[PDB]
Amino acid sequence: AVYLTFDSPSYRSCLMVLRICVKRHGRLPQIVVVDNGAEFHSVYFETLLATFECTKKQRPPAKARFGSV
């Protein structure tokens, strides 16, 4: 899923990419890595991942190879 918005990183971002994911494809990941953003340390994204049963994985700060691909 690809999303484009003028705003800085904020949940809306996340609702969106995941909406399209669950829209044109069908479901959603199983383990979703996501750096140590704020959009990911928020309550909304974690609650949504819990609701849809996605294992949330977090790379350590300043390390980029963990999401290198």
Next chain:
DNA sequence: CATCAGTTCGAGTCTGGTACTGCCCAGTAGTGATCTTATTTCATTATGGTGA
């Protein structure tokens, strides 16, 4: 002798000792209504440091 003092009789007046009558108010505890207040929640609002 007839004047005044010591004696009587019965009525006037108070008072204790004993019993009794004709009459409605006052206080208290139920409810239902309508305020009233020392005290317990429902939102905004400011402060905080750091990884994308």
